[PDB]
């Protein structure tokens, strides 16, 4: 208290000091279900890929290890990650991930990025500007390029319109390039949109074939499909959780709220995920934050005494701050787990102040008609209910009058503020040195 007040002595009164939080005890990571999850990966290291405009699809889900394999998949490859950190892929359960594999030349590798232009970037492949995910591109000269010329891979250049992110065009119709009508016949003002690739091991790296794999995760709700590492439940204690990705701390408990079969998570009129269904045992949980609360100190003033009694505002202390473990709470001082007496008020509850019945006038306000003071029960801190004043019954009667016979010329005083200090500032002096 005197630390927050920045003074060596304090006065009679209750001073807010800090906040009290029940620290989590354990860690619950149920990261999958009755089974596991995986991306099947593998594809990464393979030869027969597809054309630039032929990215692949992989609704990968549950089977092998999501990761810890593909650092060695090839000597060198591209690891450009948008959003998630490259060191944190194994621990993040991506739900919706899209795996696109295709072959482009080295020169157009830089064109595989949001906000890029070129033969492929403008027309063939478009990456969204809000893209989150990673892209894998490695030199596949010694598995794609053919000595006689691997023309199986192809690219599109004479395309009229741009594609949207993850848009495709399988049509190989003749492109109408100019004013002269073609009627579907290539010739004047008409080029074939598709062009073959010159793929041969004896070629420049810029023109060398590069198998390009794109990972497009989606980092929001719904069940996931990929996370390397996990079990246990915990049903009544404040414990950290990692429900298939959702990372946070709360008190797990049973939920009487009924989920529809498709309902994965729950909420309230808030941001918090008030309810989550277990990744396994399809149980409806009632995730709630631990029992925290502001802690305030009631002191009669250092000068009078150095004994204090603390108040845990907004806490039912039948069990939360009385059964505090060794430094399980930010206040610490576990010797004050019970102290002198514990009393439950309507403004939290009182620790170290003994409740009495003899109501007095308010000395140190608490709340809900409770005050504290330091006097005899041989001096301690009491928690008397407020006394509103002396109960005086006026002897009213239909025929009786009370008339003063004397007087006192009382001279009271009153203090009223009138003006404050006339301060002035200076931007150029203050904001800028």
């Amino acid at each position, epitope marked *: 208290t005197k630390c927050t007040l920045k003074s060596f002595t304090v006065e009679k009164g209750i001073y807010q000091t800090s906040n009290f939080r029940v620290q989590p005890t354990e860690s619950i990571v149920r990261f999958p279900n009755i089974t596991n999850l995986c991306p099947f990966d593998e594809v990464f290291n393979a030869t027969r890929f597809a054309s630039v405009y032929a990215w692949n699809r992989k609704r990968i889900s549950n089977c092998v290890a999501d990761y810890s394999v593909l*650092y060695n998949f090839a*000597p*060198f*490859f*591209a*690891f*450009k*990650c948008y959003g998630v950190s*490259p060191t944190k892929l194994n621990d993040l359960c991506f739900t919706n991930v899209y795996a696109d594999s295709f072959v482009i030349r*080295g*020169n157009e*590798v*830089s064109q595989i990025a949001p906000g890029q232009t070129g033969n492929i970037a403008d027309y063939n492949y478009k990456l969204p500007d809000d893209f989150t995910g990673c892209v894998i*591109a490695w*030199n596949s*000269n*010694k598995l794609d390029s053919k000595v006689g010329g691997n023309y199986n891979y192809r690219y599109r250049l004479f395309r009229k319109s741009n594609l949207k992110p993850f848009e495709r065009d399988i049509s190989t119709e003749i492109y109408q390039a100019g004013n002269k009508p073609c009627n579907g016949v290539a010739g004047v003002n008409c080029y074939f949109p598709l062009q073959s690739y010159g793929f041969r*091991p*004896t*070629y*420049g*790296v*810029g023109h*060398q074939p590069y198998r390009v794999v794109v990972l497009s995760f989606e980092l929001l709700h719904a069940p996931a499909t990929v996370c390397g590492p996990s079990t246990n439940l915990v049903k009544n204690k404040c414990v950290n959780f990692n429900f298939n990705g959702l990372t946070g701390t709360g008190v797990l408990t049973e939920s009487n709220k009924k989920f529809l079969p498709f309902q994965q998570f729950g909420r309230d009129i808030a941001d918090t995920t008030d309810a989550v269904r277990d990744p396994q045992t399809l149980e409806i949980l009632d995730i709630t934050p631990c029992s925290f609360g502001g802690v305030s100190v009631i002191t009669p003033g250092t000068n009078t005494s150095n004994q204090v009694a603390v108040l845990y505002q907004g806490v039912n202390c039948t069990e939360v701050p009385v059964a505090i473990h060794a430094d399980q709470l930010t206040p610490t001082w576990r010797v004050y787990s019970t102290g002198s007496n514990v009393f439950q008020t309507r403004a939290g509850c009182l620790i170290g102040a003994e409740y009495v019945n003899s109501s007095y006038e308010c000395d140190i306000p608490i709340g809900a008609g409770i005050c504290a003071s330091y006097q005899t029960q041989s001096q301690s801190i009491i928690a008397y209910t407020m006394s509103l004043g002396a109960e005086n019954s006026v002897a009213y009667s239909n025929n009786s009058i009370a008339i003063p016979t004397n007087f006192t010329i009382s001279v009271t005083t009153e203090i009223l503020p009138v003006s404050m200090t006339k301060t002035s500032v200076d931007c150029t002096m203050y904001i800028c040195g």
Partner: nanobody
Amino acid sequence: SAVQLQASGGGFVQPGGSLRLSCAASGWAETFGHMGWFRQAPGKEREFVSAIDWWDTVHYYADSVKGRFTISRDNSKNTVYLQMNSLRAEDTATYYCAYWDMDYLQNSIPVDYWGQGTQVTVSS
């Protein structure tokens, strides 16, 4: 990111001699960076030497290395060389094959990854 670089070459060159260095690339990188050597003169601060891009489209040279330095990357094993033409006698230094994990080299001072040094003396 974590990139392991395999640099090799060196020996004992003479005034007017030449080198054919090498620097193989392996490992995953956040971006397809450009290889090169980032050499200090003996007792001097580290300095940029010569740059080649992964696409074989961008080349860089410096005044202290002009006319006697050239960088080229192999198309087969992806080991970038340092082809030489009449190296002078004052290149008795250790050549470090550093790595810049950026698609464009706006400034050469920030280097993402370092390689192995190649100590070659130029004397007869």
